[PDB]
Amino acid sequence: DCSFQHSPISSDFAVKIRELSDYLLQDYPVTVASNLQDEELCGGLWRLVLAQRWMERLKTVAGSKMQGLLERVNTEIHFVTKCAFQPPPSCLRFVQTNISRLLQETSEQLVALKPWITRQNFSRCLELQC
């Protein structure tokens, strides 16, 4: 299953993203899923899981001080790991995009997800769909 009783989405998450972006080289290449099935319940959650996977990869190649900014943005979206999300399906295609694009979308997904995170049952989001 996958659901959250009390809200795991912070009010000041947009701050941690603007702070990370202030020390970032905006066209650093990251990826985003190109063919994620249209699902207005799991959609943002699937991308947050993916964006989350990116925050971890980035921390490993980040400098001492950049590691803190990444980790702090990682904390804002780390709750997605509280759920047993299945590994991406073979059908899922990824496309190279700027880290600024990924950060912007992550912010957007958190905003849209904020009013629903505690009201919905996200058990069917565990399997990413194309």
């Binding site: 009783q5 809200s7 912070s10 009010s11």
Partner: protein
């Protein structure tokens, strides 16, 4: 351009332009004309005792160029900060009233952020301050930290009917898995009287702010409020809807010897914060009107200077007054044993005992009227060549003087 005139003041008003040459002026007073003769260029209009008549629109036209100047001559409150949640987002706003308009600074303890709008409302000691020509009045945001140790005194919150109630409930927990809830006098809480903010701390910690507010309070809103967390102990605070001063004005009496370390005290529950004054033998000194946090404020006075007498404590607020009379009170001293009689002063009543034999025998006799005591004995002696001694006794000590015959 804006002039502030304090009472019937005598000041000069001059203006200089970086171009001294053969240039002419013309003064244009409040709906009336005026002639001028200046210096090379600086022009002036001086005034001795500026009456309410001699104030307003005063212009000064010049010609080399064809220039014109204008001045607004005006003549010479501080209401504590109030709070209002910005309808736009999850942030608080400080509404402080005052004449002159004040500096509104938010202080989160310490760190000062002069903004009038605070968005970083998380933890510490949050207090808004207003600072103008009069001074600085501050309103502290009432907080209940469930995460912190209890002040277990069932804190009392006082406020006048119509004022806005603000109670921030802060709780810090390891995981984000916890909630917060508000409850009035047994009753829960109105939907338009609650708001929840949340952020992360240190090693993936979570801080929650569940504040409760009343737009304009009434008798209906007075009662015992409590905040409970779904991972924390329920801490409470009672709200007393209300100017007054409550203290025992029994007028207390005291007495000490210039060897004892002592401070006069006065415990009082009073709203609004009172203006206090400790006066004695006309010489008046202000007080450190500190809080005892128990449910009253205790004012102290220590600079007694071993000086005896009446120490009066007068305390008053905008709609209430008060005064408490504190009496203060040695070895007897023979003030004077002049001739024949003998006088001594002491506290308490000095006892006068007489002896007269020149082996020291004693005779007793005399009238006494009094603290200073004057006791005498007629010196009509059948016998001579003796010494008499006057003795003043007090529980504390004794002293005496001798006379010759």
């Amino acid at each position: 351009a804006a002039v502030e005139v304090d009472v019937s003041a005598s000041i000069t008003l001059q203006v200089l332009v970086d171009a001294p040459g053969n240039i002419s002026c013309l003064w244009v007073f409040k709906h009336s004309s005026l002639n001028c003769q200046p210096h090379f260029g600086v022009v002036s209009m001086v005034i001795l005792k500026m009456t309410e008549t001699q104030a307003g629109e005063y212009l000064l036209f010049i010609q080399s160029t064809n220039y014109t100047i204008l001045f607004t001559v005006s003549i010479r409150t501080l209401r504590r900060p109030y709070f209002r949640k910005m309808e736009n987002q999850d942030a608080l706003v400080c509404i402080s009233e005052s004449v002159p308009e004040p500096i509104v600074e938010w202080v989160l303890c310490v760190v000062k952020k002069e903004e009038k709008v605070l968005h970083e409302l998380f933890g510490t000691d949050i207090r808004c301050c207003a600072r103008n020509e009069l001074g600085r009045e501050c309103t502290r945001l009432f907080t209940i930290d469930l995460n912190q140790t209890p002040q277990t005194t069932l804190p009392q919150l006082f406020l006048k009917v119509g004022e806005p109630l603000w109670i921030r409930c802060k709780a810090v927990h390891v995981n984000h898995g916890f909630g917060l809830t508000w409850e009035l006098e047994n009753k829960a809480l109105e939907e338009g009287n609650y708001f929840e903010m949340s952020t992360y701390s240190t090693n993936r910690t979570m801080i929650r702010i569940l504040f409760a507010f009343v737009s304009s309070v009434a008798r209906n809103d007075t009662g015992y409020y409590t905040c409970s967390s779904s991972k924390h102990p329920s801490q409470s605070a009672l709200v007393t809807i209300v100017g007054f001063i409550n203290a025992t004005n029994s007028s207390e009496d005291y007495e000490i010897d210039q060897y004892e370390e002592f401070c006069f005290s006065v415990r009082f529950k009073a709203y609004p914060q009172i203006r206090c004054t400790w006066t004695f033998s006309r010489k008046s000194f202000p007080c450190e009107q500190k809080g005892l946090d128990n449910g009253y404020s205790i004012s102290k006075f220590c600079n007694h200077k071993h000086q005896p007498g009446e120490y009066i404590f007068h305390a008053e607020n905008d709609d209430a007054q008060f005064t408490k009379m504190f009496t203060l009170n040695r070895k007897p001293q023979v003030l004077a044993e002049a001739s024949a009689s003998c006088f001594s002063d002491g506290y308490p009543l000095p006892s006068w005992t007489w002896k007269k034999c020149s082996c020291t025998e004693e005779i007793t006799e005399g009238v006494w009227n009094r603290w200073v005591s004057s006791s005498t004995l007629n010196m009509s002696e059948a016998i001579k060549g003796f010494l008499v001694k006057c003795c003043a006794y007090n529980s504390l000590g004794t002293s005496c003087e001798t006379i010759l015959l």
